[PDB]
Amino acid sequence: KETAAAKFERQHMDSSTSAASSSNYCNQMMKSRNLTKDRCKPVNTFVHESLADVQAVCSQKNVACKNGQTNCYQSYSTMSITDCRETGSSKYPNCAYKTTQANKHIIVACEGNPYVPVHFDASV
């Protein structure tokens, strides 16, 4: 089965670009990372930082997760991210997104040994 750590990398890591490439980026990436296979996933964030820098967030500021669990962590530094947001006119299987870049602190949930990101909770 795909591991939880690998699923986070597939859904949320894009270190090959420094920023929300193009207006096409979320349309291409939501499809290529398999987030439009079963339905249009409504919102998703990609992080444009190294894998090591995202993994290191699991040792940074401990914050409450939106679900009330305690295993979330906020990055001390801002990170380059792209938020993808399904358009009003998007109909599966032709899932359409708006691409918006930001520089924000990320909040991730971490689990396991090694203790690594398994969930993207929020950006602030």
Answer yes or no: are the C-beta atoms of 86 and 111 closer than 8 Å: no
Catalytic center residues: 12, 119
Resolution to 1 decimal, in Å? 1.1
Answer yes or no: are the C-beta atoms of 100 and 82 closer than 8 Å: yes
* Way the structure was solved: X-ray
Confirm or deny that 114 is annotated as ligand binding: no
Nearest to 82 by CA among 21, 40, 24, 33: 21
Taking the chain, what is the end-to-end CA distance rounded to the nearest angstrom? 32
Nearest to 73 by CA among 7, 26, 1, 8: 8
Question: Which domains does the chain show, CATH number per domain?
Answer: 2-124 (3.10.130.10)
How far apart are the C-alpha atoms of 29 and 36, rounded to whole Å? 10
Using the structure block, give the residue that is written with the tokens 């969930």.
Answer: 119
Confirm or deny that 7 is annotated as ligand binding: yes
Confirm or deny that 91 is annotated as ligand binding: no
